[PDB]
């Protein structure tokens, strides 16, 4: 059919959409994540801005640990073990929301984070050094 371009759903505006279409708009949800009155009102705004900047910095450092610094989407070397709720790729990327995916993976996600931290950036490194 005829078209004109993309649209702008907003911050957290694609939570009801499928995983194959909400992964194209990670830029929107990554952009928004970043006298008496001079004593009271201004310091709360300053603390909020400092807290937001520091939370973004901690989270970007956690992405940079795995060799995935800066990039929104990147690939790693661990394999997808079949015990982590195996499904077809078509039904994962076409028939699920991201909320249902994190409902279905939340028992195993710390093992994924530990396998990403222990391997890759400590397995590509310490092997390139020898």
């Amino acid at each position, epitope marked *: *059919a*005829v*078209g*004109i*371009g993309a*649209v*702008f*759903l*907003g911050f957290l*505006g694609a939570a009801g959409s499928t995983m194959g279409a909400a992964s194209m708009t990670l830029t929107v949800q990554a952009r928004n994540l970043l006298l008496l009155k001079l004593t009271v009102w201004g310091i709360k705004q300053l603390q909020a801005r400092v807290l937001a900047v520091e939370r973004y910095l901690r989270d970007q450092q956690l992405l940079g640990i795995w060799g995935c610094s800066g990039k929104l989407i990147c690939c790693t070397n661990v394999p997808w073990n079949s015990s982590w709720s195996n499904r077809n790729l078509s039904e994962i990327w076409d028939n699920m929301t991201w909320l249902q995916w994190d409902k279905e993976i939340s028992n195993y996600t710390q093992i994924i984070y530990g396998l990403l931290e222990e391997s890759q950036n400590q397995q590509e490194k310490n092997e390139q050094d020898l």
Partner: nanobody
Framework: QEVLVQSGAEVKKPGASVKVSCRAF????????LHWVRQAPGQGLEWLGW????????TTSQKFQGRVYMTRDKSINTAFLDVTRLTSDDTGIYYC???????????????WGQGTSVT
């Protein structure tokens, strides 16, 4: 819940220009493409144009270029349509329609206004 609220009916003389507004309620206005359509009494539906409320790009048929102009305002979430050199054949009721807009394409018009009468 998702409705479209417009202005009142207007009566204008030929050769002038008429302005109609359409405001969105119940949904994010910058999410779906917006169509404009007219109705003369006793005829079938025939279509004016459609606009993205995020980019501001407009598109009109092959026989109304330089005749109508569509603009948008994201602060009040209002789309403006202006018709120039009014004639006797443009007398009728006006509708703004939200397109459902699945897969970045035109699908269908589900939310309508209550119609602006121009004469």
């Amino acid at each position: 819940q998702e409705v479209l609220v417009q202005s009142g009916a207007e009566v204008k003389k030929p050769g002038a220009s008429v302005k109609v507004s359409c405001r969105a309620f119940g949904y994010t206005f910058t999410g779906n493409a917006l169509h404009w359509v007219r109705q003369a009494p006793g005829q079938g539906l025939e279509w004016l144009g459609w606009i993205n409320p995020h980019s501001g790009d407009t598109t009109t048929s092959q026989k109304f270029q330089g005749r109508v102009y569509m603009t948008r305002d994201k602060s009040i979430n209002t789309a403006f349509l202006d018709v120039t050199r009014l004639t006797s054949d443009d007398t009728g009721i006006y509708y703004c329609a939200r397109d459902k807009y699945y897969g970045n394409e035109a699908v269908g018009m589900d939310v309508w206004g209550q119609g602006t009468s121009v004469t």
